[PDB]
Structure formats: C-alpha cells, structure tokens
Amino acid sequence: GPADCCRMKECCTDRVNECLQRYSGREDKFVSFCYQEATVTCGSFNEIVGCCYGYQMCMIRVVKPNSLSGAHEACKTVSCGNPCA
Amino acid sequence: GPADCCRMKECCTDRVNECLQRYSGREDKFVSFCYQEATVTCGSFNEIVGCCYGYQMCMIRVVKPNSLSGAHEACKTVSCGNPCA
Amino acid sequence: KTSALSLSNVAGVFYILVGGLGLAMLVALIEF
Amino acid sequence: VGELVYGKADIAIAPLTITLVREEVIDFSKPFMSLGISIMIKKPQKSKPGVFSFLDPLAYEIWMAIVFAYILVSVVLFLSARIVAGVWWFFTLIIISSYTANLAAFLTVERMVSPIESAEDLSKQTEIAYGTLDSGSTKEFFRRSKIAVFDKMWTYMRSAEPSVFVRTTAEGVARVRKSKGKYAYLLESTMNEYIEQRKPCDTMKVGGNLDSKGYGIATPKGSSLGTPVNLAVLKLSEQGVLDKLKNKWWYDKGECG
Amino acid sequence: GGNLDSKGYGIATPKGSSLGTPVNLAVLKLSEQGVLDKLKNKWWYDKGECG
Amino acid sequence: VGELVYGKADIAIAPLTITLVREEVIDFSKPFMSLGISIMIKKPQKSKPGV
Amino acid sequence: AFLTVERMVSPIESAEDLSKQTEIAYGTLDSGSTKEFFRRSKIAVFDKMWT
Amino acid sequence: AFLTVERMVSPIESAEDLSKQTEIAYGTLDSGSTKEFFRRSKIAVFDKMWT
Amino acid sequence: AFLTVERMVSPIESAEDLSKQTEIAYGTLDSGSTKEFFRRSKIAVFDKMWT
Numbered sequence: 170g171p172a173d174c175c176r177m178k179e180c181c182t183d184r185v186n187e188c189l190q191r192y193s194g195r196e197d198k199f200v201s202f203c204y205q206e207a208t209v210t211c212g213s214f215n216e217i218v219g220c221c222y223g224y225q226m227c228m229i230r231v232v233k234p235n236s237l238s239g240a241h242e243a244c245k246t247v248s249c250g251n252p253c254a
Numbered sequence: 255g256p257a258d259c260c261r262m263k264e265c266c267t268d269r270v271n272e273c274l275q276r277y278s279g280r281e282d283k284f285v286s287f288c289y290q291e292a293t294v295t296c297g298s299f300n301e302i303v304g305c306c307y308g309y310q311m312c313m314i315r316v317v318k319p320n321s322l323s324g325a326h327e328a329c330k331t332v333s334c335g336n337p338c339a
Numbered sequence: 340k341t342s343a344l345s346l347s348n349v350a351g352v353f354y355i356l357v358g359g360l361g362l363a364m365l366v367a368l369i370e371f
Numbered sequence: 372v373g374e375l376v377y378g379k380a381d382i383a384i385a386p387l388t389i390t391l392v393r394e395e396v397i398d399f400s401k402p403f404m405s406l407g408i409s410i411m412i413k414k415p416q417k418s419k420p421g422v423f424s425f426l427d428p429l430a431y432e433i434w435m436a437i438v439f440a441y442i443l444v445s446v447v448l449f450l451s452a453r454i455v456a457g458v459w460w461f462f463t464l465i466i467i468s469s470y471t472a473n474l475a476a477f478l479t480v481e482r483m484v485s486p487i488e489s490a491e492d493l494s495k496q497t498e499i500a501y502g503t504l505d506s507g508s509t510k511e512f513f514r515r516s517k518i519a520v521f522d523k524m525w526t527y528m529r530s531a532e533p534s535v536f537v538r539t540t541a542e543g544v545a546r547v548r549k550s551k552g553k554y555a556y557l558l559e560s561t562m563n564e565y566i567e568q569r570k571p572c573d574t575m576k577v578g579g580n581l582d583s584k585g586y587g588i589a590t591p592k593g594s595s596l597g598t599p600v601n602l603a604v605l606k607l608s609e610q611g612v613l614d615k616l617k618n619k620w621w622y623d624k625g626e627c628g
Numbered sequence: 629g630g631n632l633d634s635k636g637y638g639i640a641t642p643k644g645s646s647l648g649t650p651v652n653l654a655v656l657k658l659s660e661q662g663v664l665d666k667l668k669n670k671w672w673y674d675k676g677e678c679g
Numbered sequence: 680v681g682e683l684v685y686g687k688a689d690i691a692i693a694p695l696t697i698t699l700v701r702e703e704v705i706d707f708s709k710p711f712m713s714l715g716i717s718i719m720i721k722k723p724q725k726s727k728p729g730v
Numbered sequence: 731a732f733l734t735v736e737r738m739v740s741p742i743e744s745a746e747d748l749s750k751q752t753e754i755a756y757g758t759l760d761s762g763s764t765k766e767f768f769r770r771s772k773i774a775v776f777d778k779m780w781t
Numbered sequence: 782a783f784l785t786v787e788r789m790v791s792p793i794e795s796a797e798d799l800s801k802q803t804e805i806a807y808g809t810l811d812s813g814s815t816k817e818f819f820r821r822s823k824i825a826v827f828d829k830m831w832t
Numbered sequence: 833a834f835l836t837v838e839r840m841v842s843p844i845e846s847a848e849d850l851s852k853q854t855e856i857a858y859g860t861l862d863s864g865s866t867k868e869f870f871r872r873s874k875i876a877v878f879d880k881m882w883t
C-alpha cells in the first residue's frame with residue numbers, strides 16, 4: 170500500500186523497543202540488531218539508513234544495561250533526520 | 255539540524271491549512287500555491303515532492319469551495335508517500 | 340595534431356648514410 | 372507570472388517555459404513551441420593551411436640535414452659509385468617512408484578527435500568552462516535536478532570561480548565568441564537555433580537536448596480566456612500556422628540560413 | 629528524413645473530473661524527474677537489438 | 680474517447696494523439712511524449728562504393 | 731587516414747521528394763490522426779500526397 | 782589502417798562501459814556481499830547494472 | 833600506426849634498489865608512523881635502509 174514516513178517512525182521506535190525488551194540486561198549490545206529487525210518490519214525508504222536513523226544513533230550512544238526504559242523514553246522523540254541518504 | 259519527516263508533515267499540513275484559510279471560497283483554486291508556501295516554510299527532502307505530497311493530492315482532489323475545514327480535517331492524516339521521490 | 344619533428348630518430352639513418360659515404364670515399368681513394 | 376497572479380495582466384504571451392512550479396500558480400495552454408536545454412559553442416576555424424603544414428611533419432632540422440646530405444652525396448660521387456647510390460637509396464627510402472608515416476599520423480589524429488558530443492562529456496572535462504543564465508528555467512532545472520550528470524554540472528557551475536553565469540543571452544553568446552571556444556553556453560534549443568542562423572554564424576549547437584519541454588501561453592487560474600486560448604493554440608497547431616511562423620522568423624530570412 | 633508535423637500524446641480524462649489536475653501535475657513531475665525519459669529509454673532503446 | 684465521454688471509463692492512458700477535435704470533448708493532460716508523422720522504408724542492403 | 735577513419739553516411743529522400751515520384755507507392759493507416767492530417771492538410775506537398 | 786587498429790587502445794576502460802553496452806553479458810554470485818552491494822546501491826552506474 | 837598510437841614508458845626502481853645504491857640519498861619525516869616503521873622493522877631491506 171501507501172508509504173508514510175511518520176507512520177514509519179512511530180512503528181520504528183516501537184519495534185526497536187519491543188525487540189530490545191527480550192534482550193534485557195544485554196540491551197546495550199543488541200541495539201543495532203533490533204534496529205535491523207525494526208527496519209525490516211516497518212520498512213525503510215533507503216535500506217542503508219533504516220526506518221529512523223537518529224533514534225538509532227541516540228539509543229546506541231545513550232542505552233546502558235537495564236537503563237532501557239528511560240533511554241527509549243528519552244530517544245523516541247528524537248529527529249530521524251533525512252531518510253534519503 | 256535534522257528535519258524529522260513527521261514534524262515536517264505536521265508543519266506541512268498546518269501551513270497549508272492556515273494558508274488556505276486566508277482565501278475564502280477560492281480554496282480549491284489556491285491549493286497548490288499554499289502547498290508551495292508550506293513546502294517553503296517547512297522545508298523539504300526533495301524540492302519537487304514537497305513536505306507532504308499525499309496530503310497535497312488529497313486536498314486538490316477533495317477540496318471544494320467553502321468546504322475547506324472538513325476537507326483539510328479529512329486529509330491531514332493521510333500518508334505522505336515517498337519523501338525522496 | 341601533436342607535431343612530431345622526429346629528427347633525433349632519423350639522425351641515425353643520417354649517420355649510417357655518412358658512414359656509407361665515408362666507406363665510399365675510402366673505396367674511391369683506394370681505387371685511384 | 373507576477374502580473375498574472377496579482378491581476379495586472381489578463382494573459383501572458385512570450386517564450387515562457389512550462390514548469391511545475393509555474394503550473395501550480397498559473398494555467399498553461401498546450402505548448403505552441405517545442406524546446407530543450409542545449410549546448411552552444413564556437414565553431415572551429417575551417418583552415419589556416421599556409422605552406423608550413425607541408426614542412427610540419429618533417430622537421431626543419433631534417434630538411435637542412437637532407438640538403439647538406441644531398442650535396443655531400445653529390446660531392447662524394449664527384450670523387451665505388453654503386454654503394455653510394457645504394458646507401459643514398461636506403462637513406463631517401465627511410466626518409467620518404469618516415470615522412471609518409473608521420474603525415475599519415477597527423478591526418479589520422481586530426482580525423483580521429485571530436486571536441487564535444489553531449490552534456491556528459493562536458494561533465495567529464497575541466498578544460499572547457501560552461502554556464503547558464505543568472506536566472507530562469509534552465510538554472511532552476513539544474514538546481515532542482517537529482518540526475519547524476521546534471522547534478523555534477525550544477526555543483527561545478529555554482530562552485531567554479533570566476534562565476535560562469537551571465538545576465539543576458541546576448542552576453543552569454545558574446546562570451547562564447549570571445550572565449551575562443553573555452554566557454555560553452557547552455558540555453559534552450561530555440562534560441563540556440565536562432566543565434567546559429569544569424570551572422571557572423573560563428574556559433575553552433577552540439578548534440579541533442581538535455582530535457583524535453585515546451586513554451587506556452589499563460590492565463591490566470593479560473594480565467595475565462597484559458598479554454599478559448601488553448602483550443603486556438605490547437606487550431607493553429609493543426610493548421611500549420613505555428614510551423615510556418617517559426618520558419619518565418621527563424622529560418623526563412625536567415626542570412627546564413 | 630524529418631517529421632512532417634510536431635505533436636504529442638496525452639492522458640485523457642472526462643471534462644470536469646476530479647482526476648484531471650492531479651494527473652496533469654503528475655505528468656509534469658514525472659517529466660522533470662526524467663521518469664518519462666528513462667521509461668522511453670527502457671522500452672525503446674535499452675533492449676534495442678540493432679545497435 | 681467514446682468510453683470517456685459516455686462514462687464507461689474514468690481515465691485513458693495510451694498513445695492517444697492530441698487533436699483539437701479530441702480536445703473539444705475531453706481534457707488532455709500535458710503531453711507525456713513527443714512525436715511526429717515520419718516515413719518508414721526498407722534499408723538498402725549495401726551502398727555502391729563508386730569510382 | 732581515410733581508411734583509418736571508417737566513417738559511413740547514409741543519405742535520405744525526406745518528405746519533399748516523395749510527392750514528386752510515382753515509382754515508390756506509400757500509405758498510412760485506414761483511419762486515425764495521420765490519415766486525418768493528410769485529409770485536412772492545406773499544404774501543397776501533403777495535399778498532393780493525399781490526392 | 783589495419784596496424785593502426787592493432788596498436789589502438791581502449792578495448793575496456795571502466796565499470797561504466799559494461800553499463801553502456803548490451804552485447805557483453807555480465808554477472809555476480811547468487812548471494813554474498815557483491816550482489817547485495819549492487820542491490821542496495823543508490824549510485825547511478827551500479828544501479829543500472831543491477832537493473 | 834606506431835606514430836599514430838605513440839606510447840608510454842614506465843620505469844620502476846622499486847624499494848630494494850634504494851637499499852642497493854648510495855648514489856641517490858633518501859629520507860622520511862622527522863617523526864610519524866613511517867619513521868617508526870623503518871625503526872622497528874625486522875625485515876632485511878627496510879632494516880638496511882633505516883641503518
């Protein structure tokens with residue numbers, strides 16, 4: 170059907186988070202994996218960039234073990250940047 | 255300074271609407287102009303596409319004279335499509 | 340166009356010419 | 372466009388290029404003329420032969436040397452002769468073969484090379500500068516273009532110093548004439564054909580058009596004139612009025628035409 | 629030789645249809661994007677067997 | 680064109696030549712392709728080299 | 731040099747010559763914009779061709 | 782002329798040459814980093830090649 | 833032919849020859865990874881060069 174960048178973002182953050190939840194306590198290790206799975210499920214305009222790139226970066230640098238919930242809650246509002254390149 | 259396509263979308267719809275409000279009864283004629291102003295004000299990832307393309311098409315095909323408010327209220331949730339193409 | 344002016348390369352054949360003429364002078368001398 | 376939107380004019384008739392940005396604000400009648408962004412350069416000078424082009428392949432040193440060699444062979448023969456005639460024959464053999472080969476190389480090189488084919492070639496070389504007008508549909512096209520070649524060209528043009536952009540068409544053409552072919556002018560095919568048909572006729576258009584678009588007659592959105600004007604343009608198109616008109620102004624009275 | 633006349637094809641819509649202006653603007657967008665050019669090269673030239 | 684005027688179809692996309700007679704009944708989007716009437720012949724198998 | 735060039739050019743008869751000869755017959759489709767163009771044409775050459 | 786052709790260069794230059802000719806077919810592995818590189822590539826030449 | 837094509841001659845003295853000749857002096861920067869590479873190098877040639 171039709172693509173929506175906004176819907177893609179809101180889906181992206183949620184799928185990333187829900188993915189990281191199974192990985193609790195190792196959470197800081199798996200950010201990119203879960204970001205891959207989320208980019209797959211929510212789709213992306215550029216396969217390299219992913220659904221939301223800025224959120225991924227924010228999570229990667231912020232997320233600490235077991236600190237997940239607060240980290241995600243802080244990072245989910247973050248600007249995704251340009252989903253072209 | 256990231257654009258964040260969701261924020262870009264909300265801005266796009268908002269500026270289009272606020273612009274079309276200035277033109278009463280001519281609303282269906284000025285859709286593209288106000289969309290131009292909105293793409294200018296909110297910025298765009300692709301200058302051709304604009305901030306939100308699907309919303310623009312939705313407005314153009316739906317909006318009738320004096321029908322502004324309801325038409326916009328119906329069109330603002332619509333998927334913007336591919337912002338890079 | 341790349342103007343050649345190949346004179347260096349042709350100079351050798353000029354030298355074998357001069358050598359041939361030298362030997363020629365030699366034969367002309369030993370004859371007389 | 373400004374006069375049309377703000378109602379200072381009822382209609383716009385001019386070589387106005389049809390663009391989406393303009394189609395959003397105004398209404399364009401069906402295109403009355405076809406054009407495209409094209410490349411204009413200075414035509415290469417036909418010939419400057421002299422008598423020197425004959426002495427070009429064989430160096431001046433070789434001519435002096437072969438003259439002295441000639442008189443040397445004569446004075447050697449004046450003083451056995453078989454090897455002289457043989458060696459001289461071999462000598463002049465190598466020389467005529469060398470002259471033939473070198474001249475062949477000259478003509479081959481001259482017939483082999485072409486200056487410019489398309490726009491892509493312009494993108495691939497830094498030797499010949501090129502540019503467009505300070506404003507208008509061509510510049511905007513290059514700016515808004517996501518296509519590789521055109522993108523590269525825009526980056527180059529905007530970044531290059533001194534500025535490659537000109538204020539007027541006549542200025543750009545003048546720059547084409549003065550630059551000895553070091554400057555190329557990007558302009559719509561129409562203007563290119565027109566300038567190419569006017570004396571001194573030192574300028575020419577190379578390759579095809581970068582894009583395919585057309586001019587049009589513009590009317591304010593929701594004006595009564597729009598449909599009559601459009602249908603009229605169609606009438607003129609089918610009747611051949613447009614063809615005959617273009618031939619009238621461009622080609623027919625062409626001095627070099 | 630050349631062409632006898634200069635004309636073009638088009639997408640046709642009923643007069644007063646809602647689709648007309650969107651279709652038109654779409655054709656313009658596709659035109660500047662090079663979609664028309666690339667498509668024509670796709671079907672005509674690219675697989676062209678005559679060289 | 681008939682299908683469009685009499686409403687059996689909402690849109691027509693095809694190599695439909697734009698004509699005044701057609702432009703009177705329906706609406707044409709800006710032309711998506713340029714063409715013209717041209718002549719097609721049989722290509723000569725060889726060309727005489729000449730003296 | 732000529733032999734190294736290997737350039738081959740193919741001449742054409744264009745449109746104007748075609749009106750002037752009876753040797754090569756020529757035609758268009760049974761209907762459509764081309765036939766209609768020739769029919770309605772007030773231009774000398776095309777007129778002759780139509781006749 | 783023949784010997785000029787013999788010592789004449791430019792049989793093959795770059796990757797772009799493969800994109801510019803349909804005469805010589807070319808390919809990659811059924812899987813692995815190369816195919817995926819061509820797949821996800823947004824840059825012109827490689828994109829064309831992937832298509 | 834060979835005049836039309838011309839040619840290019842590319843010589844290489846490589847690395848070891850610098851170790852084999854005292855005619856051409858050679859050196860590196862006062863500091864940085866290159867000098868350190870030559871210093872700590874356990875390879876014969878580079879060792880000699882450093883010496």
Ligand SMILES: CC(C)S(=O)(=O)NC[C@H](C)c1ccc(-c2ccc([C@@H](C)CNS(=O)(=O)C(C)C)cc2)cc1
Nearest residue numbers: 401402404405583585634635636659709710712713
């Ligand atoms: C702005 C673009 C969307 S576009 O120009 O409309 N389409 C691009 C496409 C390649 C194209 C571009 C130009 C033309 C075109 C064809 C013919 C003419 C003139 C000679 C006749 N006008 S007309 O429109 O065909 C007539 C029937 C009145 C002028 C322009 C046809 C197709």
Ligand SMILES: C=C(C)[C@H]1CN[C@H](C(=O)O)[C@H]1CC(=O)O
Nearest residue numbers: 386387388506507508509510559
């Ligand atoms: C001659 C001028 C300034 C006009 C004519 N067509 C283009 C236009 O309609 O904007 C402009 C030229 C160009 O920008 O290539």
Ligand SMILES: C=C(C)[C@H]1CN[C@H](C(=O)O)[C@H]1CC(=O)O
Nearest residue numbers: 694695696759761762763764765
């Ligand atoms: C292919 C056909 C029958 C169509 C296509 N364009 C022309 C048209 O739109 O009338 C017709 C050809 C022609 O008239 O020779």
Ligand SMILES: C=C(C)[C@H]1CN[C@H](C(=O)O)[C@H]1CC(=O)O
Nearest residue numbers: 809810812813814815816817818
């Ligand atoms: C040999 C294979 C299948 C491997 C080796 N390196 C690439 C890789 O690491 O995926 C693959 C080759 C390729 O993709 O061209």
Ligand SMILES: C=C(C)[C@H]1CN[C@H](C(=O)O)[C@H]1CC(=O)O
Nearest residue numbers: 860861862863864865866867868
């Ligand atoms: C310029 C300097 C001192 C730096 C640059 N790269 C090397 C480095 O990053 O150490 C050094 C050069 C060298 O060691 O030859």
